[PDB]
Amino acid sequence: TRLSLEAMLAERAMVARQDLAGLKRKLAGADRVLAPQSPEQCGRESAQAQARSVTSELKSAVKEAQGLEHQTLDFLEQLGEYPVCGILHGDHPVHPSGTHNNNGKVSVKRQFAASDALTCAFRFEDSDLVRETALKTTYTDGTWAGFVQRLKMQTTRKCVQEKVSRKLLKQLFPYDPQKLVDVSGELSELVLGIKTNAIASAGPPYWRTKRDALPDMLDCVLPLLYDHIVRKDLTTLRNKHPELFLAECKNKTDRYEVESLGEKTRPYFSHPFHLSALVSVLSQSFSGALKIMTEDSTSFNAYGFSWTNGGAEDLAIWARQAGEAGKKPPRIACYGDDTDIYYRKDGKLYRICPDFKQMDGSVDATTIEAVVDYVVDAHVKQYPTARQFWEEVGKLWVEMATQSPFLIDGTKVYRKMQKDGLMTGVVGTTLFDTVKSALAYNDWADQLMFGSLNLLEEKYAIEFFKNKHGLVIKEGTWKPALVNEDPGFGELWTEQKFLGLQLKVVRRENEKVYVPNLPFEDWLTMWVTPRSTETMRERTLFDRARGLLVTGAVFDERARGLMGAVINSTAPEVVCMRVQISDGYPSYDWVVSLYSRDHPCDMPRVFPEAATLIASYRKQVMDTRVVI
Amino acid sequence: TRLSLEAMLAERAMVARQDLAGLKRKLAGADRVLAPQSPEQCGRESAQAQARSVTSELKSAVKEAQGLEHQTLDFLEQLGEYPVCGILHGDHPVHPSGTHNNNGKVSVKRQFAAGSDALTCAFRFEDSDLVRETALKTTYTDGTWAGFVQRLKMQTTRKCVQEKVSRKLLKQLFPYDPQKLVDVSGELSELVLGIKTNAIASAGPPYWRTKRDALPDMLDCVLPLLYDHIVRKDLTTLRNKHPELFLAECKNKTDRYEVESLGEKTRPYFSHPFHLSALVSVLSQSFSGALKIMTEDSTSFNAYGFSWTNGGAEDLAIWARQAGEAGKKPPRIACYGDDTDIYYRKDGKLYRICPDFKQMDGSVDATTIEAVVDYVVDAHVKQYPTARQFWEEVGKLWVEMATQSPFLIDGTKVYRKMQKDGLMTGVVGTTLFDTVKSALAYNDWADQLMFGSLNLLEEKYAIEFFKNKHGLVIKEGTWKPALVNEDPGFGELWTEQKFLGLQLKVVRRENEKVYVPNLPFEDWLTMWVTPRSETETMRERTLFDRARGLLVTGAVFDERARGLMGAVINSTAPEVVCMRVISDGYPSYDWVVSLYSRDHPCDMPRVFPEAATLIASYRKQVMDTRVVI
RNA sequence: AAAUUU
RNA sequence: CAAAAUUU
RNA sequence: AAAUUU
RNA sequence: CAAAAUUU
Ligand SMILES: O=c1ccn([C@@H]2O[C@H](COP(=O)(O)NP(=O)(O)OP(=O)(O)O)[C@@H](O)[C@H]2O)c(=O)[nH]1
Ligand SMILES: O=c1ccn([C@@H]2O[C@H](COP(=O)(O)NP(=O)(O)OP(=O)(O)O)[C@@H](O)[C@H]2O)c(=O)[nH]1
Ligand SMILES: [Mn+2]
DSSP states (O other): OEEEHHHHHHHHHHHHTTOHHHHHHHHTTOOOOOOOOOOOOSOHHHHHHHHHHHHHHHHHHHHHHHTSOOOOSTTSEEEEEOBOOOOEETTEESSOTTSSEETTEEOBOOOOOOOHHHHHHHHHSOHHHHHHHHHHEEEEOOOHHHHHHHHHHHHSOOOOOOOOOHHHHHHHSOBOGGGSOOTTSOHHHHHHTOEEETTSBOOTTTOSBHHHHHHIIIIIIHHHHHHHHHTTOHHHHHHHOGGGGOEEEEEOOEEEEGGGTTTOOOEEEEOOHHHHHHHHHHHHHHHHHBOOTTTOTTOOBOTTOOSTTTHHHHHHHHHHTOOBTTTSOOEEEEETTEEEEEEEETTEEEEEOOBBSSGGGGOOHHHHHHHHHHHHHHHHHHSGGGHHHHHHHHHHHHHHHHTOOEESSBSEEEEOSSSOSOOBTBTTHHHHHHHHHHHHHHHHHHHHHTTOGGGGSHHHHHHHHHHHHOOOBOTTOOOOEEOOSSOOTTOBSOSOOBTTBEEEEEEETTEEEEEEEOOHHHHHHHHHSOOOOHHHHHHHHHHHHHHHHHHTGGGSHHHHHHHHHHHHHSOHHHHHSOOOOOOBOOOHHHHHHHHTTOOOOOOOBSSTTHHHHHHTOOOOOOOTTOOO | OEEEHHHHHHHHHHHHTTOHHHHHHHTTTOOOOOOOOOOOOSOHHHHHHHHHHHHHHHHHHHHHHHTSOOOOSTTSEEEEEOBOOOOEETTEESSOTTSSEETTEEOBOOOOOOOOHHHHHHHHHSOHHHHHHHHHHEEEEOOOHHHHHHHHHHHHSOOOOOOOOOHHHHHHHSOBOGGGSOOTTSOHHHHHHTOEEETTSBOOTTTOSBHHHHHHIIIIIIHHHHHHHHHTTOHHHHHHHOGGGGOEEEEEOOEEEEGGGTTTOOOEEEEOOHHHHHHHHHHHHHHHHHBOOTTTOTTOOBOTTOOSTTTHHHHHHHHHHTOOBTTTSOOEEEEETTEEEEEEEETTEEEEEOOBBSSGGGGOOHHHHHHHHHHHHHHHHHHSGGGHHHHHHHHHHHHHHHHTOOEESSBSEEEEOSSSOSOOBTBTTHHHHHHHHHHHHHHHHHHHHHTTOGGGGSHHHHHHHHHHHHOOOBOTTOOOOEEOOSSOOTTOBSOSOOBTTBEEEEEEETTEEEEEEEOOHHHHHHHHHSOOOOOHHHHHHHHHHHHHHHHHHTGGGSHHHHHHHHHHHHHSOHHHHHSOOOTTBOOOHHHHHHHHSSOOOOOOOBSSTTHHHHHHTOOOOOOOTTOOO
């Protein structure tokens, strides 16, 4: 009741942005700063019909592939059935009563189920292109057949142990010791500091979101785990409550090639919240301290690299200092299985952008153990009072990464027969892949110095990584290319992709700004396969179009036109409504600014008078000093 | 959707306090710090039945009194009918279609309706005969036509006396800090945006909706129009073209009324246009913020701003004691509207009078009103001279609203007060105007004591004096001088009289004396059973809040009232105590004593000390990572 | 809430 | 969405 | 949101 | 709740 008028106006503002009908009415006359758009190609009805037709074909293709028989799970170790956890937190079990329980045994059921975006594509683009694009890739749960095949490939690959030491990791993966979290502090506070996905599964035995399981984890399971860690008593705990150390093997819903649905569906592992949270203390602290290649010339690390705020140009600057192959250091930087390589032949700069196939399967136990050691050691050198505890956590970490028992479908509990091979989904997954990859390329570079310059060639490179590192180069990814070291306006560094994107130079006045880029076809693939009321659907179209523009679609003339069309199609009320109000849009100029070294600024408003129109008030200066 | 666990816990905490069902489950049986309470007298069904029975009698009494004929409104000037305002703000009229409009004329309909959980609680925990007689004596009601018109006439037609007043005299009685005054030479929009108001109060004509709903129409449309016409000396053009912009509504106040006197007494007030009140509030609120009170400055007669808390109750006593021998040295006099505390000595002994004026607004003369407006405007322009002319124009509007505004009552007929004298209660500054008139009269009273007229201490001559010399009527039985207990014993009263509706009492804390407000049980009980007013939960929560409020105001210092409020508090379900709406605390005796003392502020004690952790299902446990393994 | 990436 | 990096 | 006061 | 003062 008793409120200042200023405050009252603010309250009215918030409330107003929730009333769609009122927004629609107040914005109805407003000047709209339209995005650049390409013209319509056909009407709603035709576009919907074409979308329906494509969706219908995809649905049958997916349903057929999902119907395929899957091969036996004999390649895994069998450990029988596990009893459901009996642990109570107050008046309820930590494992909910009616869930994931077949006659007292833990059970799971894999889901393999069978577009607004697609309609937009047909509305604004050539039918044949949209149709062939939409029929090649689909966002899907995948297939049993594909799931099991990839699982086998991930769990039974012949690996090679890397030759690694702390000295070598210090060189390739330098970090700032002062940025490491003081893990000598009290454990509860440290755990409370970790970030996570609130709606991700908390794993066994919570069988609900991390948000829902949080109290059960912190108040009940974590102290129990701590007590048993510090008393060297984990085996008692494991035997009495096996579900506390159980993972779930899941099929990843993803953008999969329709052609290969029955051969390829990615598995990952969801671990218990209490274990992942504990390991995250070390892992997230270490991530925060890690340098990237653009900050330290010895680092092979791109885990942490950003294209924005000069990053794209930093990559180029870093790359150019690469030396003559066999004489001076190349420039190599790794992010998981994805690597950018620069070297000179007769002073000319070359680039390779190779990838590894099902890489996690090739990550050897030595590399995993060395990475855990390096992270643990980094912390205990800086905070020595807590050495023993964190070494124990180190052991759990390694176990989760290599040997965790797991469910797939039903009650049968499996384990990977060999220790080698990374259990994708463990905390630190990406770091493990990055390190394995970097050790291999570090060895590769050493061999160049010893004179073996034929390792620059596809044939010998593929042989080398297979034989010497147990790593499989993805077909067609070893294609050295002459780099455009100083690109012209609108020209590319090379046609190759690193971290899914090409590097290009665009003009601003007479300056060159380095920005990400892809051909239209790639942007279109992303557009028509979203990674998923009428109002929320309309708003999602708006948001996805903005996102793609920002990522680099704005620098492709056809993609920019498509995204702009979608943006301009979004009703004013949907643009301006309160959301989890973002009523700006990525203009070309703003996106260029984002990738440049400019100070951060807000996206331009779609409706510049929205604030005042929504409030039904535009301030007018009234001077109290006037002569009367 | 990626957050820290700490943040996730915080989100869960906020959500949890809104999930009543979950709160109910988690706090069921929780360790509860019970308030002191008197025992149950009867159960709910019996108490509800008794409440129903009392409510039924009150309803008939009110309905009968509302049926009484009212006297004609011929004592006011008639101005005919006003056309509804045609001003548009964008796609809508400022005066909404189909409201307050009788065939194109502004119209209004007075509401006198004949419409308790509180009463049920009273019966649950107190003697039936006492609750019943208490509840039948006072009711919260719209009042009556008969009573409304009688008080309206008394307010608009009283023979007033012009005060002898000047800036010099007001500086003396109403000192202020000039440095606290708002810089009113700033830009107008910013100044207006800075005023506080009641969001759900009527915005008046021509908006005919809440201030919250009318705010854009006011700021964006009407206020600039008003400003343009002010600065061009063109207000009469505006008045003629859009009369509704300068129209008030005369309304009946819903209030606690004696059932006996329903047909004789219902308070009238005036609701003015938002644009005019907002403008004047810039000056008035600024001035209120600068005003000193009697406990800060020995010359001040002003209690507008006084607080009983944080030593205030003791400050009153300290201030009072320095009163001198009547006819030799200054008394101690302090005014808040029509309510005044007076201290003097006869043969060195301290006496107290707590007189009140009857329908005081009717007695406030136009000279006093004009002087107060001048004093406030001048205070600002002395500090910020660049804006003199504008604020003098606002000064003129201010006077017009407080003495001569045209107004509706019921139907389309527009009235005006025939005489300029008499305050139109509801204008911005209402309380200050009353306070000043009252203080001028008492200042004169005190002067006459010095000139030798010591019989003005006596009821007979005091009443005569205020009537004849100031046009003010002392309410009967409010002039009763009393020997003050200057150093009160533990549990003793300063005197039995009320100032600002409360007695002053001394309570013991260890071996210290703390000065606190107090009333007899019957008064607290009257307040309890007549709330100044939806789920069962919100009703239960309101009971909890009213019980706490009364305790804090001083009910905690009466044994039976403390017991009643405590019983209500202890009856409140845990979920209702702990839900999102300080909130989950209760006023213990010790905490309330601390509030009235000069102690630093602290939170009320928790009803459920471990509520936070129980609700979260998490108690932090220290786990040491430095352990040897 | 959204986009890209691994 | 299992862990994650980069964006607004 | 709530109590008292004018 | 017409303007308000004090308080939680
Ligand atoms: O969502 C993801 C995608 C990829 N990765 C990591 O990326 C690495 C390789 O990805 P992958 O092992 O999942 N299969 P992939 O190599 O993509 O097969 P292909 O279709 O031939 O390219 C693995 O080591 C994963 O751990 C993730 O951790 N999460
Ligand atoms: O709710 C209120 C009460 C009082 N007042 C103002 O304060 C003045 C005195 O306040 P008052 O409330 O004590 N009563 P008064 O009308 O003088 O006589 P009576 O009814 O017999 O006790 C009134 O005359 C009004 O101007 C208000 O503005 N609002
Ligand atoms: Mn990959």
